[PDB]
Amino acid sequence: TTTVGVIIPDISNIFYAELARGIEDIATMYKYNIILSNSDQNQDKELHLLNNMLGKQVDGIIFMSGNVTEEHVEELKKSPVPVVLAASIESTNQIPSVTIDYEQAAFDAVQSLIDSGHKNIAFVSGTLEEPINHAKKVKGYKRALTESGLPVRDSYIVEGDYTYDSGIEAVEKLLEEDEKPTAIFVGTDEMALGVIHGAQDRGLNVPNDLEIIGFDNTRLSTMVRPQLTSVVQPMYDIGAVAMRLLTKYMNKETVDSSIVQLPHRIEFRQSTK
Amino acid sequence: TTTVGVIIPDISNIFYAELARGIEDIATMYKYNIILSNSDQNQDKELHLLNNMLGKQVDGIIFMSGNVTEEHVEELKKSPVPVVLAASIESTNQIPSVTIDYEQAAFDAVQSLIDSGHKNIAFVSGTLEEPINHAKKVKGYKRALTESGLPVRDSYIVEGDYTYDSGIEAVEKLLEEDEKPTAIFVGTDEMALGVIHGAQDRGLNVPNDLEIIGFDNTRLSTMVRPQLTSVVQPMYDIGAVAMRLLTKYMNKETVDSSIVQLPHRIEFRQSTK
Numbered sequence: 001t002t003t004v005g006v007i008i009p010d011i012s013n014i015f016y017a018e019l020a021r022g023i024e025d026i027a028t029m030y031k032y033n034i035i036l037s038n039s040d041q042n043q044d045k046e047l048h049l050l051n052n053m054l055g056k057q058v059d060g061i062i063f064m065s066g067n068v069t070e071e072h073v074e075e076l077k078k079s080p081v082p083v084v085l086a087a088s089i090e091s092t093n094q095i096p097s098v099t100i101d102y103e104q105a106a107f108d109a110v111q112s113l114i115d116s117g118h119k120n121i122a123f124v125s126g127t128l129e130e131p132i133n134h135a136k137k138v139k140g141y142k143r144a145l146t147e148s149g150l151p152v153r154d155s156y157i158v159e160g161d162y163t164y165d166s167g168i169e170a171v172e173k174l175l176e177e178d179e180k181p182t183a184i185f186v187g188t189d190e191m192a193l194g195v196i197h198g199a200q201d202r203g204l205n206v207p208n209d210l211e212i213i214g215f216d217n218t219r220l221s222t223m224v225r226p227q228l229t230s231v232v233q234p235m236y237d238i239g240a241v242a243m244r245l246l247t248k249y250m251n252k253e254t255v256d257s258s259i260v261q262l263p264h265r266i267e268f269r270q271s272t273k
Numbered sequence: 274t275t276t277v278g279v280i281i282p283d284i285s286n287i288f289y290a291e292l293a294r295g296i297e298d299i300a301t302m303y304k305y306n307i308i309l310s311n312s313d314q315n316q317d318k319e320l321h322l323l324n325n326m327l328g329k330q331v332d333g334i335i336f337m338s339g340n341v342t343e344e345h346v347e348e349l350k351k352s353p354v355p356v357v358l359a360a361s362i363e364s365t366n367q368i369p370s371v372t373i374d375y376e377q378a379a380f381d382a383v384q385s386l387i388d389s390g391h392k393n394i395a396f397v398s399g400t401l402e403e404p405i406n407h408a409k410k411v412k413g414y415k416r417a418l419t420e421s422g423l424p425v426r427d428s429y430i431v432e433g434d435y436t437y438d439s440g441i442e443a444v445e446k447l448l449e450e451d452e453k454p455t456a457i458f459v460g461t462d463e464m465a466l467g468v469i470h471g472a473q474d475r476g477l478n479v480p481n482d483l484e485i486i487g488f489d490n491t492r493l494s495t496m497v498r499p500q501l502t503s504v505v506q507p508m509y510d511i512g513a514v515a516m517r518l519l520t521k522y523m524n525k526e527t528v529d530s531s532i533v534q535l536p537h538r539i540e541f542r543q544s545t546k
């Protein structure tokens with residue numbers, strides 16, 4: 001029999017949960033059994049779990065993290081079972097990964113506000129410590145403005161903590177800079193909602209005044225009013241392409257493509273014109 | 274060295290998620306490992322998983338199901354390990370469980386509306402098949418009505434399927450009733466956000482044209498405008514109590530109360546006056 005271990009950062013986070021769930025639906029069909037164990041986003045419970053898992057005789061692991069350190073990549077470069085990352089970074093492309101190009105994804109998002117006429121666009125990102133942000137999305141945010149000639153006033157990039165409440169704070173701040181942004185690209189659907197309500201509670205209208213874009217195309221995108229235009233991430237595909245990938249290293253049937261990049265898209269709703 | 278397993282219907286549901294968090298934190302105090310698995314609210318996967326645990330070497334099991342069929346308990350009556358339900362009833366009162374008084378809970382909500390002067394009050398339930406609804410929530414919904422002289426109308430009791438959109442769908446049907454309601458009690462927050470939004474997409478205001486009260490008091494309550502008045506369920510505490518009680522069972526200590534009901538409450542916000 002075969003049992004794979006799945007470890008996610010925040011059991012609460014609606015993106016890692018829908019993802020983890022999808023993987024358990026796929027494992028059901030593979031007849032594999034899953035041992036799910038939360039990480040609580042702290043770098044201490046992760047490695048500790050990477051150890052816990054082997055202490056449970058797993059045959060392979062699906063790994064998800066906001067920040068995959070070099071200390072992480074090394075420890076992860078010597079496991080008695082295979083391992084692959086689901087929607088996580090490792091811009092060195094050393095360990096198995098199935099994600100989307102956050103870089104361009106973040107670029108298109110901002111790119112569309114430009115085209116809509118927006119000169120000064122803001123950006124609400126998560127912990128600038130996680131590479132998904134400081135490395136890929138921000139670069140996407142800045143490459144959109146710099147490439148179009150528009151300036152990158154660092155006063156337009158505020159950090160939130162993936163919380164709806166930190167979303168409502170980010171809006172109050174950005175709605176204080178003399179030059180009030182006309183568009184805001186948020187890196188998360190949850191925060192985005194906080195951005196929206198925060199702007200509505202100030203008497204602003206989405207999107208006739210402030211236009212907004214979220215990330216993940218999460219169930220919450222269509223549970224807000226106005227509906228949130230968001231960057232779609234191939235849910236089932238990230239998990240399935242990852243599990244069959246893990247099945248190869250588990251059956252040793254090695255393949256010439258260890259760094260899978262699935263395509264993205266943007267779901268335009270009402271948060272933009 | 275002992276571990277413990279928890280079976281939840283949908284790790285995607287922020288509801289069952291705010292609870293598994295409470296069992297974990299009591300586990301990192303009692304020293305056991307925490308194993309989880311998704312049920313999909315499907316019978317096939319339940320009794321099944323109820324045995325998969327008998328293979329992953331567990332010592333106790335925390336179970337949560339919208340419908341604990343009389344057969345589930347039967348197939349659970351032959352468990353090689355202690356079982357104790359969480360936030361899920363049965364009506365057989367023989368297998369260990371920790372919940373709240375769903376019936377009184379439903380009663381206080383609709384009473385709070387009647388006490389605001391409402392007379393035409395609706396109820397948007399989850400699948401009436403589940404005992405959690407037909408045996409408890411609707412019962413309490415009617416009690417509060419029949420105890421105040423208010424009529425009970427079949428048209429006012431609309432079924433849904435725990436989805437946001439089903440709530441949208443429920444407000445449309447209710448609003449197309451000659452006798453239009455002024456308040457609506459909803460069995461779930463996710464559905465309640467749909468009832469709220471659905472109302473606003475039709476020009477109605479919240480709470481001046483319609484007052485609604487959710488149930489569970491999940492984070493969704495505060496991610497709406499107007500924020501949602503919801504019946505509170507001690508999600509965290511339910512876990513802890515369940516854990517401590519499963520503990521007694523595995524450590525072979527006599528239990529003086531096999532069935533536990535914690536208190537409930539109502540957190541009023543602005544979806545209510």
